[PDB]
Amino acid sequence: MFEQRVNSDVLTVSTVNSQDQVTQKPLRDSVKQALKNYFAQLNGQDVNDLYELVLAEVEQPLLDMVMQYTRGNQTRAALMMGINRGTLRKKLKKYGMN
Amino acid sequence: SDVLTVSTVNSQDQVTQKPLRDSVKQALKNYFAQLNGQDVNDLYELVLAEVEQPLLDMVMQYTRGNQTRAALMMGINRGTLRKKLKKYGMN
DNA sequence: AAATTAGTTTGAATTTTGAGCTAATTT
DNA sequence: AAATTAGCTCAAAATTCAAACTAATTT
């Protein structure tokens, strides 16, 4: 009665395919393509912050959406994110969203 | 100005970059839409695993398996990296 | 009026980090 | 032959955490 939804089809993105059909692909792939383009535009320059970079690039929308969803309620936001409320307030401060 | 972008196409077959954060945001909007007031519990680990896996995979590819250089690139400790590789069973 | 939340501290648990070591591997 | 890396420990630095508690908000 219940079809398996793979972890990878939970957070998905609308894409256009070789037959100009709209399909949902994993967010993984967005991250992969972004990273491939980032790597492609390096030309052997040295990197030391890739994790923080991606992490910021991903934490910011997450907080944005979860704050919109809870209508500013940090406790609920923290509770649905699965993190301590203080950690959440910290992150919110980090991205100037309080 | 945006180092992490993905490629989009519009109805006029023009290709254009867009920040990865727009993708993440879309995916979340879709997530919140798909569930109807069902409770979310571990959204951070969800997304973080969802973002950490292809990152590790791509940096390990870029450094041809060299964990020390991968770790240096990412700006984390080699131990942390080994741990993360263990976590997603890629080692 | 109750309840819930924000804003803050405090100390414990967990995680990340660096550094040191030898074995194995790459150069 | 040398240099680098992996696999591994130790403990200490940093971060996350829960538990308070009152003021302030919301219900």
Author numbering:
A (entry chain B): 1 to 98
B (entry chain A): 8 to 98
What does the article say, verbatim?
Multiple X-ray crystal structures of Fis-DNA complexes reveal that most of the Fis contacts are to the DNA backbone and extend over a 21 bp segment. The importance of the A/T-rich center (-2 to +2) is due to the requirement for a compressed minor groove, which enables the recognition helices in the Fis dimer to contact the consecutive major grooves.
We first tested the effects of individually substituting base pairs flanking the core at positions ±8, ±9, and ±10 in the context of the high affinity F1 site. These data indicate that the base at ±8 can have a large effect on Fis binding with a G being strongly inhibitory (150-fold poorer binding) and an A being moderately inhibitory (10-fold poorer binding). We determined X-ray structures of Fis complexes for each of the ±8 variants to elucidate the structural origins of the observed binding and lifetime differences. There are few differences in the overall structures of the proteins (RMSDs within 0.27 Å) and DNAs (RMSDs within 0.36 Å) in pairwise comparisons between the F1, F1±8C, F1±8A, and F1±8G complexes. We suggest that a G/C or A/T bp at ±8 may increase the cost required to assume a DNA conformation that allows for the formation of the critical contacts to the ±8 phosphate. The magnitude of the shift in the DNA backbone between ±6 and ±8 correlates qualitatively with the effects of the ±8 substitutions on binding affinity, complex stability, and DNA bending. Another notable difference between the F1 and each of the ±8 variant structures is the van der Waals contact with the ±8 thymine methyl group made by the Arg85 guanidinium group and the Thr75 γ-hydroxyl group. These contacts are absent in the F1±8A, F1±8C, and F1±8G structures, but the positions of the Arg85 and Thr75 side chains are unchanged.
